[PDB]
Amino acid sequence: SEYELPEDPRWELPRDRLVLGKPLGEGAFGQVVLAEAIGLPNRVTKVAVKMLKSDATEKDLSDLISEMEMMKMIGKHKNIINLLGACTQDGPLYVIVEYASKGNLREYLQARRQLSSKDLVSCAYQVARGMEYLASKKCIHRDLAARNVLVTEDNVMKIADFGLADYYKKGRLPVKWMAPEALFDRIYTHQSDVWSFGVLLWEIFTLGGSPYPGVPVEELFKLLKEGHRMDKPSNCTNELYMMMRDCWHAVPSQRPTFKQLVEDLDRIVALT
Amino acid sequence: ELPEDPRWELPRDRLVLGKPLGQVVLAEAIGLPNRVTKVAVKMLKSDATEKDLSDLISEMEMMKMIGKHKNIINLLGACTQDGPLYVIVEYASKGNLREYLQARRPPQLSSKDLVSCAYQVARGMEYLASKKCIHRDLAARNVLVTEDNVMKIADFGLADIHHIDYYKKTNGRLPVKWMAPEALFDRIYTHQSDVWSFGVLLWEIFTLGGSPYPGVPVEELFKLLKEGHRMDKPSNCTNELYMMMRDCWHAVPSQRPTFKQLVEDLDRIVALTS
Ligand SMILES: CCN(CC)CCCCNc1ncc2cc(-c3cc(OC)cc(OC)c3)c(NC(=O)NC(C)(C)C)nc2n1
Ligand SMILES: CCN(CC)CCCCNc1ncc2cc(-c3cc(OC)cc(OC)c3)c(NC(=O)NC(C)(C)C)nc2n1
Prior knowledge:
Two copies of one chain form a homodimer.
Chain A: E1 18-26, E2 30-38, E3 44-52, H1 58-74, E4 83-87, E5 94-98, H2 105-110, H3 117-136, E6 149-151, E7 157-159, H4 180-184, H5 190-205, H6 217-225, H7 238-247, H8 258-270
Antiparallel strand pairs in A: 1-2, 2-3, 3-5, 4-5, 6-7
The structure holds ligand PD1 (2 copies).
Residues 24-27, 32, 48, 50, 67, 81, 95, 97, 99-103, 107, 150, 160-163 of chain A line the site of one copy of the ligand CCN(CC)CCCCNc1ncc2cc(-c3cc(OC)cc(OC)c3)c(NC(=O)NC(C)(C)C)nc2n1.
């Protein structure tokens, strides 16, 4: 709201206990910066702080608040970027979350082209867990992709942007991750996230590969309508490839659920 | 108007014309005395211009000079006198290599079959290279397969690089996707740019008739090419053959291997292939 944000003692962290740092990046909404929180009672923890940019509007604030509240409703899980604290009173809002020192999975996977066969499946399993969790919390990500997966210093995959309140905007095209029903019928479901997870799996087995390179939107919709499915990556069992194709099944009910995926991948990680 | 040639002429009555292939028609040639041989016959259309008759003759004369080789569609004869020009060439019952490959995809060909298929193409190309012939459109579509599974390169002596339409499709594909960057941008065609094309063809063998750059339009293809993009390794294909593919797509023309080299490597791999 305009003059003062709602109070919640549970999450509030005294601004003096937070020391803002080197910005991690930015976007339309606002801005994220590295920082150092104290006693989340006198030990410094590194965190990422999201906040509004100086050109923000009441709605931009309203979106950052909604994003914080949603993270609050959802709850904690090892495989998602968790809420750690918040400075809401007397000053700009600060959404304090977990810090992922190795950036998103795409960048992670490319700098290491050195992961093992178990590691690649281990990474896919952790992303499936987090999604199962978000799904058990009624959460529909709608933009699952390696970019929205962040990796910690200890290599823990963490789903990001799951609580975020132009088919041509890039520099890859996010529509390339979209389930046909969500892209044609605007039908966003937990199953559509399962489609996007397939495209993510492929990103894992191509070590940061770019899906449909050189293929513009109009062309993508055509391949989709023609039932075309990306080729099986080199270094990826026919089994893991069935899983990708499984997730890319036209009929959303026929695609596997995140719970099943977590199960299959559990097993596969063991048989790797 | 057409000069008779004792070397290749076959009496028109010896050519039992048959079913259309796609103009090329299947046909039976008696003699070539009491034996018939299945052959393919190229002839002009009804609305064929005098230019089309020039190219057709040219394609024949080019075939006459190039000589015979196991891995190319050889010339068998011609019906030039009194009537339509019939250019009788070898018959490939199993169609082109793309179809051959696709129609054998699992719901089969071995690894040695596929590697052996690349070897034969390379030999076809090598002979043609040894004879000063640059193909310009080497692709699986331009390789035909005989009943014995013999790979035969087609349309090598074909009749303008300055009149080619880039936005034209084939099965709905863009031939520019087989073109080397310098042949596409600088209009420079050499044996080397044919080597780039053989690399794309190699990629089609290992993807069982796979389409290069799905959904990628001409304008976007130039961009990938300018950025130095290279297709990914086909699944079920060695790092050694992917490497060969990669060497064929070497940015620098003078650095790509020659067909003579390709033939030596493929021959070594076939022998080692399971
Ligand atoms: C760039 C150099 N390398 C090497 C690869 C290191 C980078 C380290 C990146 N460390 C990091 N660690 C945690 C982050 C968390 C968020 C984030 C913030 C949220 O606020 C409420 C919610 C959320 O999930 C629901 C995630 C984030 N958000 C973000 O938008 N970041 C950009 C840069 C894209 C603007 N970035 C983060 N970065
Ligand atoms: C159901 C699958 N079924 C369809 C009937 C099998 C198809 C088998 C096709 N069997 C065949 N066997 C030999 C051919 C030779 C040529 C050919 C002709 C030339 O003339 C001087 C030169 C040349 O290269 C030097 C090759 C050719 N040419 C051609 O352009 N053919 C199409 C169909 C594309 C018009 N086609 C051929 N086809």
